[PDB]
Design an enzyme around this catalytic site. Structure first.
Site, PDB file in Angstrom:
ATOM      1  N   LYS A  24      37.522 -36.386 -47.876  1.00  0.00           N
ATOM      2  CA  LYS A  24      37.230 -37.715 -47.433  1.00  0.00           C
ATOM      3  C   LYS A  24      35.768 -38.031 -47.719  1.00  0.00           C
ATOM      4  O   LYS A  24      34.898 -37.143 -47.663  1.00  0.00           O
ATOM      5  CB  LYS A  24      37.493 -37.813 -45.875  1.00  0.00           C
ATOM      6  CG  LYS A  24      37.064 -39.113 -45.282  1.00  0.00           C
ATOM      7  CD  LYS A  24      37.328 -39.163 -43.743  1.00  0.00           C
ATOM      8  CE  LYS A  24      36.036 -38.982 -42.995  1.00  0.00           C
ATOM      9  NZ  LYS A  24      35.252 -40.236 -42.886  1.00  0.00           N
TER      10      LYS A  24
ATOM     11  N   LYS B 206      29.895 -39.631 -44.276  1.00  0.00           N
ATOM     12  CA  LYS B 206      28.515 -40.063 -44.086  1.00  0.00           C
ATOM     13  C   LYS B 206      27.635 -38.908 -44.071  1.00  0.00           C
ATOM     14  O   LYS B 206      26.407 -38.970 -44.147  1.00  0.00           O
ATOM     15  CB  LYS B 206      28.383 -40.789 -42.780  1.00  0.00           C
ATOM     16  CG  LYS B 206      28.658 -39.884 -41.575  1.00  0.00           C
ATOM     17  CD  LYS B 206      28.056 -40.491 -40.409  1.00  0.00           C
ATOM     18  CE  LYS B 206      27.929 -41.919 -40.723  1.00  0.00           C
ATOM     19  NZ  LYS B 206      29.159 -42.702 -40.478  1.00  0.00           N
TER      20      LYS B 206
ATOM     21  N   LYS C 143      34.051 -30.744 -36.508  1.00  0.00           N
ATOM     22  CA  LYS C 143      32.644 -30.876 -36.162  1.00  0.00           C
ATOM     23  C   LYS C 143      32.105 -29.634 -35.477  1.00  0.00           C
ATOM     24  O   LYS C 143      30.909 -29.389 -35.466  1.00  0.00           O
ATOM     25  CB  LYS C 143      32.425 -32.091 -35.259  1.00  0.00           C
ATOM     26  CG  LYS C 143      32.807 -33.424 -35.873  1.00  0.00           C
ATOM     27  CD  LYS C 143      32.471 -34.573 -34.914  1.00  0.00           C
ATOM     28  CE  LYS C 143      33.008 -35.913 -35.404  1.00  0.00           C
ATOM     29  NZ  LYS C 143      32.345 -37.068 -34.711  1.00  0.00           N
TER      30      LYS C 143
HETATM   31  N1  LIG Z   1      36.221 -42.487 -45.947  1.00  0.00           N
HETATM   32  C1  LIG Z   1      36.687 -43.447 -45.166  1.00  0.00           C
HETATM   33  N2  LIG Z   1      37.712 -44.195 -45.553  1.00  0.00           N
HETATM   34  C2  LIG Z   1      38.149 -45.164 -44.751  1.00  0.00           C
HETATM   35  N3  LIG Z   1      37.695 -45.517 -43.536  1.00  0.00           N
HETATM   36  C3  LIG Z   1      36.697 -44.700 -43.154  1.00  0.00           C
HETATM   37  C4  LIG Z   1      36.152 -43.680 -43.880  1.00  0.00           C
HETATM   38  N4  LIG Z   1      35.146 -43.054 -43.170  1.00  0.00           N
HETATM   39  C5  LIG Z   1      35.097 -43.687 -42.041  1.00  0.00           C
HETATM   40  N5  LIG Z   1      36.009 -44.717 -41.942  1.00  0.00           N
HETATM   41  C6  LIG Z   1      36.257 -45.653 -40.857  1.00  0.00           C
HETATM   42  O1  LIG Z   1      35.087 -46.333 -40.495  1.00  0.00           O
HETATM   43  C7  LIG Z   1      35.004 -46.585 -39.084  1.00  0.00           C
HETATM   44  C8  LIG Z   1      33.704 -46.032 -38.573  1.00  0.00           C
HETATM   45  O2  LIG Z   1      33.587 -44.653 -38.836  1.00  0.00           O
HETATM   46  P1  LIG Z   1      32.774 -43.628 -37.764  1.00  0.00           P
HETATM   47  O3  LIG Z   1      32.736 -42.230 -38.303  1.00  0.00           O
HETATM   48  O4  LIG Z   1      31.495 -44.284 -37.161  1.00  0.00           O
HETATM   49  O5  LIG Z   1      34.081 -43.665 -36.565  1.00  0.00           O
HETATM   50  C9  LIG Z   1      33.944 -42.937 -35.436  1.00  0.00           C
HETATM   51  O6  LIG Z   1      33.127 -42.027 -35.363  1.00  0.00           O
HETATM   52  C10 LIG Z   1      34.783 -43.400 -34.242  1.00  0.00           C
HETATM   53  N6  LIG Z   1      34.945 -42.212 -33.326  1.00  0.00           N
HETATM   54  C11 LIG Z   1      33.904 -44.476 -33.561  1.00  0.00           C
HETATM   55  C12 LIG Z   1      34.548 -45.112 -32.312  1.00  0.00           C
HETATM   56  C13 LIG Z   1      34.038 -44.866 -31.034  1.00  0.00           C
HETATM   57  N7  LIG Z   1      34.815 -45.567 -30.204  1.00  0.00           N
HETATM   58  C14 LIG Z   1      35.773 -46.229 -30.879  1.00  0.00           C
HETATM   59  C15 LIG Z   1      36.802 -47.098 -30.437  1.00  0.00           C
HETATM   60  C16 LIG Z   1      37.689 -47.680 -31.369  1.00  0.00           C
HETATM   61  C17 LIG Z   1      37.545 -47.395 -32.743  1.00  0.00           C
HETATM   62  C18 LIG Z   1      36.524 -46.556 -33.166  1.00  0.00           C
HETATM   63  C19 LIG Z   1      35.636 -45.969 -32.273  1.00  0.00           C
HETATM   64  C20 LIG Z   1      36.256 -45.927 -38.454  1.00  0.00           C
HETATM   65  O7  LIG Z   1      37.227 -46.948 -38.376  1.00  0.00           O
HETATM   66  C21 LIG Z   1      36.600 -44.882 -39.503  1.00  0.00           C
HETATM   67  O8  LIG Z   1      37.976 -44.612 -39.548  1.00  0.00           O
END
Ligand SMILES: Nc1ncnc2c1ncn2[C@@H]1O[C@H](COP(=O)(O)OC(=O)[C@@H](N)Cc2c[nH]c3ccccc23)[C@@H](O)[C@H]1O
Ligand SMILES: Nc1ncnc2c1ncn2[C@@H]1O[C@H](COP(=O)(O)OC(=O)[C@@H](N)Cc2c[nH]c3ccccc23)[C@@H](O)[C@H]1O
Ligand SMILES: [N+]
Ligand SMILES: [N+]
Lengths: 326, 326
Positions: free
Chosen positions: B192, B195, B111
């Protein structure tokens, strides 16, 4: 009326440098401004703290604030951790500050010097200090010279936030004493008097007894001029002593120089030590009374109630400006 | 019973990668565990956010969580910023994490890549995520593969805190899907699905209409084998399509390979697109209902009440362990 905010870290050593550069300002200004004086415990934990000592140091610092004359009917005295808004505001400000801005802070560079393995709170110290100040719509921040840069960064953050999200913060301004902005070590007058100096003879703590104060003043490094004249560059030792004397006695540097015209360092030092004792004695006696009173907690309770009402509302405004929450 | 915590950033684009790697797990696990599902708005602001879009994206994400089937009687759904404990806990954890530990996070490196002037929230992203998880005495953290490292750091922090201050935290453990842990871009299957991909054909959003889904699936980059067999290394495109098909249809990879024995990519893609539409349609219709209902806010209100009761108590314990406050 305008608003003042200022903080001090709770620690094992609160010095006459803290008194002269800050606490003396707090008491001076308390009746003319809305005042918020804080015990910055979350800032204290930026370096490892023994938990038992910390809890005591926080009570010790509250006692010293009241001992020096901070009046709870004129000011709000509270503990940083007891007002969640500070941590909330700090996160929002951390999101708008650049890593380079934090890295160039002298406080950070000094505290992290020659370390392996630096704890992140040390680096993110400023956004939390900015949140402390900005939360209360602060106009004036009375501190010693060493905090000037942090306040400059706070101003930068406030302006950045206001530009990005709409005018919300008052741009605060440091108030730094003309004399006594930077009290130096008694041992090496080219260095600032620090609460962490490994040499206890470098500082005088507010709880030092008379014999100890005499020993520290007498031992204060001077020069071989036998002349009591202020000259920071040429006579750092004597000049620092003159600053302590002036600030604590109310006499001007000029006044003291005349008073001691023809006199030697011996009489000067003896007289200075008496001036320090005269200052500290009533403070110490008030301090022990506070330390044994249930009123200490009542004051902090009331201070946290007021701080929370104000800071929490500013946090709401901050969130609305950024679009957080709902 | 055990406890689950998981978060998702509110953003303009919620993908089928988010669904398959995470949301599908949330719904699967909600009846068997105490569940906390969060809209991580404070994490969202680690990069600049238009305030109006953010406020909407937070409501959008709450609606999607409920649309996919998250049941408020089985789980606690809430917004990160509405529970001050997260920011409080994050500060305490930031004080115990080392700068080097934060700097080595792949999420941070990616990032911040090729930036001037990196905002500090990006670097301090992990301590806030650790606070999210640890606050609730979390056992399991269901996520996609990209969050594994952050959870590893959370485990390191929990252990560090426990060693320094006394056992307080449960050491959480990631739960990452066997199939669908890392859904890839439809445009470049070696990347990957993100978003923030500048190419909208790389991802399918949960709100994409039927024609759009068909266009994106049909256009998905494959190979010139005309063979529908899973082989991540040799056939990244088809393998990713197979993962999407399997996870969404409930059919195994083996099942699909047989089903399509002798068949070409054309029929496969048409059938896959129908499977995506079949999945998304009911979600979209439930989503629009939530978006227009006052019940959306009531659910979040209740979720924040419960989260606050739990997190605030953990924060008290954390403070007592470190000696903050009183
Ligand atoms: N291409 C993909 N293939 C499979 N799984 C995917 C894919 N893209 C995203 N994910 C999963 O979706 C969840 C949310 O993604 P975020 O980018 O908001 O995910 C994030 O930005 C985290 N930092 C948010 C967070 C903040 N605090 C937490 C505490 C526990 C767990 C998660 C969080 C996640 O499970 C992510 O692994
Ligand atoms: N040798 C000296 N000569 C003159 N003044 C001195 C000397 N040593 C210390 N001071 C002043 O004392 C105050 C408290 O010092 P701290 O190190 O706790 O100061 C600190 O560690 C701040 N980061 C605490 C803080 C946190 N948030 C704030 C918001 C506003 C103002 C201050 C704060 C300060 O005014 C400091 O300038
Ligand atoms: N006042
Ligand atoms: N549940």
């Amino acid at each position: 009326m305008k608003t003042i905010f200022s903080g001090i870290q709770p620690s094992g050593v609160i010095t006459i440098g803290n008194y002269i550069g800050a606490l003396r300002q707090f008491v001076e200004l308390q009746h003319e401004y809305n005042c918020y004086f804080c015990i910055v415990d979350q800032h204290a934990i930026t370096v490892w703290q023994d938990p038992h000592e910390l809890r005591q140091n926080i009570r010790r610092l509250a006692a010293l604030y009241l001992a020096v004359g901070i009046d709870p009917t004129q000011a709000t005295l509270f503990i940083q951790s007891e007002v969640p808004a500070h941590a909330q505001a700090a996160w929002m400000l951390q999101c708008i500050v650049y890593i380079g801005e934090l890295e160039r802070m002298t406080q950070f560079k000094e505290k992290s010097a020659g370390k392996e393995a630096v704890s992140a709170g040390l680096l993110t110290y400023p956004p939390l200090m900015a949140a402390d100040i900005l939360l209360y719509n602060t106009d004036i921040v009375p501190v010693g010279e060493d905090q000037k840069q942090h306040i400059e960064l706070t101003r930068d953050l406030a302006e950045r936030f206001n530009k990005r999200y709409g005018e919300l913060f008052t741009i605060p301004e440091a108030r730094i004493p003309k004399v006594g902005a930077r009290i130096m070590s008694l041992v090496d007058p080219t260095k600032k008097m620090s609460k962490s100096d490994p040499n206890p003879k470098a500082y005088i703590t507010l709880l030092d007894d008379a014999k100890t104060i005499e020993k520290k003043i007498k031992s204060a490094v001077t020069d071989s001029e036998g002349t009591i004249r202020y000259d920071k560059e040429a006579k750092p030792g004597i000049s620092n002593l003159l600053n302590i004397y002036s600030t604590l006695s109310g006499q001007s540097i000029e006044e003291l120089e005349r008073q001691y015209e023809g006199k030697g360092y011996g009489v000067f030092k003896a007289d200075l030590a008496q001036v320090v004792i005269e200052t500290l004695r009533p403070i110490q006696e008030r301090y022990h009374h506070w330390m044994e009173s249930e009123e200490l907690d009542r004051v902090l309770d009331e201070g946290a109630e007021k701080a929370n009402r104000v800071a929490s509302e500013m946090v709401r405004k901050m969130e609305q400006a950024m679009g957080l929450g709902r």
